[PDB]
Amino acid sequence: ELDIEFINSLLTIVWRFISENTQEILEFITAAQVANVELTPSNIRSLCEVLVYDDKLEKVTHDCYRVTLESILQMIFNYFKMFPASKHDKEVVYFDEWT
């Protein structure tokens, strides 16, 4: 809503129910801990789109939303558990130093 942060801390709550499988989302968000007011559906369709950009959430059937099963990734298509040594090994690959 407002230009400062805590929208990132807002959006981490709404994803938790959809992992286990848009007017139903308005009942989910109203709770004790939520404070920002009047929670209009125009901000819900905007806040839902960011998780599609971050690939956490899927858009189907023009109004339905499902998880992209990033929860098992959250726990080759797996950058985690991939640690580089990066020291005393001169034969490494960089993305720069070709431009």
Binding site: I76, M82, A85, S86, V93, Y94, F95, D96
Partner: protein, 35 residues
Amino acid sequence: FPSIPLPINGPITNKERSLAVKYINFGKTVKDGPF
């Protein structure tokens, strides 16, 4: 001096360790073959 690495940098697994042995005898076959 160059930063920002590729994310594929890890210890070799036995799934590809024998696959890498198939390269070193390949070039030795060609060079110690005819040419």
